[PDB]
Subunit: 306 residues, 2 copies
C-alpha cells in the first residue's frame, strides 16, 4: 500500500537525449533512429525571438550550423527539416539505444512523466498532467527546452510532450513530438498567457478511489447524486464537467472498491462544499487531480514494463 | 521555474534489476558486477515467517535453489552468503550494465528515489524521505521486496535502501544495501510498529526557500526568532529540533534568497501557529518536508548527471 506520484522509469528515454547547439543557443534533442527532434526556436537569435519567421531563419541554415552531441560523441547532421514547431535533424548514425516508440498527442487531463534535461543530460524525472488550459505545471529552467514527456506501455515509449517555453505565471507550454503546440500558444516571445484553468474532476475521483483502496474512507457518505446535480456543483467550483464516458472509465475502480461512481461524486460534492476540516487524503490537504483512473490502477495493481 | 517532487533518472538502476525466486517466493534483486543482492527473507517459507532462523534456513539451501533471471536470460548462481539481512548470490556473469556505484547508509530526513519493481521489472520511480522514525512512506505491494532506493551524484549511483516489509500503518521498512535495517525493525513477521513520527524541520525550511525562489512570498514576515525560541514552538508541533548544523546547511539557500535562516524560522513559526488560512505553498496545503536543502538547490539550479 501507499500512494505516490509515480513517474515511469526513465531509462528508455535517457538513452535518447542529446544536446543541440545553434549559435549561442543550447538545448536538448530527442535522438530516435537517425533523427534528432528538437524545438525549432533553437535557430532563433536573442533578437529574433519577438516575431521570428522560421521558414526564413531555417533556409538560411546549413547542416554544419547544428552542433549535435550525444555524450561526448558528436553527431554529423546530414539534413534538416521543419515539421510545425519541431526541427528534425537527420544524422548519419542511428541511435542504437532507440526504444520501441510512438508519438501521441494527448488530451487535457492525461498524465505523463517528464525527463527534465540540460545540455542533453537528465536532471530528474517527475509526473505531470496536461492541464485543461493546455499548460503543464512543470519544473523547468532555461536550457530545459527539448526535454520530453512520455508514457510507457509495456515495452513502448509514447512520447507526448516536448518543452518549449515558460509562461508568466511559471507554468509551461510545449508541443507534441510532431511540433504542434498544446493550446493556443505560439513560439514567439510575446505576451500570450494561459486561459483560466480548471480541476480535472475525473482524476480527483480516481484519486479518491485510490484513497479508498489504501484505507482512507473518512470522506465517504451514504448520499448519492445524479450526474446532472453533481456537475451543477462542479461548475460552481471550476471543476471540469464529468461526462458519462468519465463515469465509464471509473468503472473498474468503482467495481474494485464497491463504491458506485455516482456515490463517490456525492463524496466529492461534500468535500467541495465543506472542505476537508483539517483532514488529509493520501497525505494531501488538497484534492489531487494529477492521477488518471489508469494511473491509479497501475500503481495499485503493480503493472510493470520492459 | 516550478517545483516538483523530482526523482533521479532511473536508467542506471533499471539495468541492475533482476528477479530472484526461491521456492514459491519471488522478489527483486540488484545485480552489480557478479553479485545479486536481495532480501534474505526470500529463503523463508510461508510458515517460517513468524520467527525464522536464517542461518539454519540458509545452510539448508543449495545454489540451484535460487532462480535468478535477468530479463529472459537466466543467471547461474555459483555461491551465496548472508550479510545481515541481505542475501548475496554470486553469479557466473558480471552485469555489463553495472554503473559506478556505492552503498551508503543514510540519516533520517535524507531523501532518495525509489525504483519500484515487480518480478525484476520496474513499475515506476518516485521520491521518498527516510522518516525520523526510520520508516518510509512508500508505494509498495507484495512482490516489491528487493526494490531499491538511491541517489545519483554526477556519475555514481549511491544505493541506500532495499525494501523488505510493510508495517500495519501502510508504511515501509527496509535495510541499507549491506542488510542493516533502518530503525528497530527485524525481518520477522510479528508485531513491531513504527515509533511516533515527526516532521523534518530542516526540510520544511528548505522547501519554504524553494517557494521564495519560485515567487511564493506570502508567508514571509518581518519577525525573527532565536533558534532556542524556534525549537520551543517546533517541539510543541512534533517538528524535529533544528540544529546549528541545519542552519549552516541552509546557508546557500539563505544567501541566494536574502532571507536569514532564523527569519525563515519565524515564518515557519507563524505558519505552525496560524495555519495557512486557505493558502497554498508550491501547490501544497500542508508544509512539505520531503525535500532536503540539497534537493532544492539541485532542482532550482538545474544540476544534471551522467
Amino acid at each position: 500500500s501507499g500512494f505516490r506520484k509515480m513517474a515511469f522509469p526513465s531509462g528508455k528515454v535517457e538513452g535518447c537525449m542529446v544536446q543541440v547547439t545553434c549559435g549561442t543557443t543550447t538545448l536538448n534533442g530527442l535522438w530516435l533512429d537517425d533523427v534528432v527532434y528538437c524545438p525549432r526556436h533553437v535557430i532563433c537569435t536573442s533578437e529574433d525571438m519577438l516575431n521570428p519567421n522560421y521558414e526564413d531563419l531555417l533556409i538560411r541554415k546549413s547542416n554544419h550550423n547544428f552542433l549535435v552531441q550525444a555524450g561526448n560523441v558528436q553527431l554529423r547532421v546530414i539534413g534538416h527539416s521543419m515539421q510545425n514547431c519541431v526541427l528534425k535533424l537527420k544524422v548519419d548514425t542511428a541511435n542504437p539505444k532507440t526504444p520501441k516508440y510512438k508519438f501521441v498527442r494527448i488530451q487535457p487531463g492525461q498524465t505523463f512523466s517528464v525527463l527534465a534535461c540540460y545540455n542533453g543530460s537528465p536532471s530528474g524525472v517527475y509526473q505531470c498532467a496536461m492541464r485543461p488550459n493546455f499548460t503543464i505545471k512543470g519544473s523547468f529552467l532555461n536550457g530545459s527546452c527539448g526535454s520530453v514527456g512520455f508514457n510507457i506501455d509495456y515495452d513502448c515509449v509514447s512520447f507526448c510532450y516536448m518543452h518549449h517555453m515558460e509562461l508568466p505565471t511559471g507554468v509551461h507550454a510545449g508541443t507534441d513530438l510532431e511540433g504542434n503546440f498544446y493550446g493556443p500558444f505560439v513560439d514567439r516571445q510575446t505576451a500570450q498567457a494561459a486561459g483560466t484553468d480548471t480541476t480535472i474532476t475525473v482524476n480527483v475521483l480516481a484519486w479518491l478511489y485510490a484513497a479508498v483502496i489504501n484505507g482512507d474512507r473518512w470522506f465517504l457518505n451514504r448520499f448519492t447524486t445524479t450526474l446532472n446535480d453533481f456537475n451543477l456543483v462542479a461548475m460552481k467550483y471550476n471543476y471540469e464537467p464529468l461526462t458519462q464516458d468519465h463515469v465509464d472509465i471509473l468503472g473498474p475502480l468503482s467495481a474494485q472498491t464497491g463504491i458506485a461512481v455516482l456515490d463517490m461524486c456525492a463524496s466529492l460534492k461534500e468535500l467541495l462544499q465543506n472542505g476537508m476540516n483539517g483532514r488529509t487524503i493520501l497525505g494531501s490537504a488538497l484534492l489531487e487531480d494529477e492521477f488518471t483512473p489508469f494511473d491509479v490502477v497501475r500503481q495499485c495493481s503493480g503493472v510493470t514494463f520492459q
